[PDB]
Amino acid sequence: SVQQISSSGGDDQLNNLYKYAIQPMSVSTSFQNVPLLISSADGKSKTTV
């Protein structure tokens, strides 16, 4: 599970700081090395976590 966190404090927004919560979709199923993806909105710059 992946969700964007809404920065309701303006101080976070002035830092240009995007935030995402990252979770297991069930607490009954252990897993390893699943790739989270990250991309810029022009489709160019990318990273895998």
Next chain:
Amino acid sequence: TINLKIQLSPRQSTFILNIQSSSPIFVESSDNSLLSVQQISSSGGDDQLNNLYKYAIQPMSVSTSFQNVPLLISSADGKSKTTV
């Protein structure tokens, strides 16, 4: 004793740059004949408690379209420098 991108248009001719810092921030245009830059005075104390510096950014004439003119930004320390 001594002390030691943005876009604008004919529908949106002003932008507001917000910047957070625990120390004073200078903001400049490299060209003050195509561009206008002014600090906004935060008359509400709520803005001041957020350490939030504010600058209005404008075209110097509505007859002269331009592109990619560098706004400069820097701390009073002189090293935390940025370009927009």
Next chain:
Amino acid sequence: SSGDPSILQVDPITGKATAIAAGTTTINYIRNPSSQTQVVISIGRIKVDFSDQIINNSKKRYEYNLKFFTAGSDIELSQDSTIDQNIKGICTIKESTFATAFFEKVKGKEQYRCVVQPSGVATSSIDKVTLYVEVSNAHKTYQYDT
């Protein structure tokens, strides 16, 4: 000796040879037991290797490894310590002032690289950080780029 001194001139004593022309020839050991090696002279490709580097910090150097290949056959050149491939080159950034670059030979090898160093933090006015690389021989009798 050389089988063709106009393709490949050699010192009869200290074995040092210089690649003069593109072609194929031999170097021969005249003393008994006598011997030979064929030699072939050809750059026609560059590869840059990224090695998982992305330009996210101005207080880092981004150091990108070069590999060089023949004309027509795309065979990588011998990275051996009895050779100097005599490769000069120029690395720069194009379209963007966000970084500078240079060309570097890894001291004590036939291994070569680009080094890139940023000027600031990326504004959303930057479309690309276009790397450019030339390579040439010591005399510039040719150039090749990417």
Next chain:
Amino acid sequence: FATAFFEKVKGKEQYRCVVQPSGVATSSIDKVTLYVEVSNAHKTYQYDTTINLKIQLSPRQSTFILNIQSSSPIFVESSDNSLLSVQQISSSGGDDQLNNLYKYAIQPMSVSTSFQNVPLLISSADGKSKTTV
């Protein structure tokens, strides 16, 4: 393209320029202007003058692309047009042209006839610079 120096011939009132080149002359050198000053040992006068002076192909790789860089036009030929095809690649992208980079496709004239060490020729349009591949 060259360096020069002044020399007095050891044991005579005979004097010379000696010139020594740095490289091969490119098609970008109209002249090699020699300059000569002479004076007495005290320089109570000076007087001077200026005077002019491999590729491999296979059933998995039947085309090679030869790139060549030059500030002047380049002819490229096979010594044998019955074993080999040679064609200039037209650079329809603009960025290619700014690099002075000539491109030639190089191919076997048939996929039924193996061959070895056929000389491709390369020359500058002034006929001075030549190379063989």
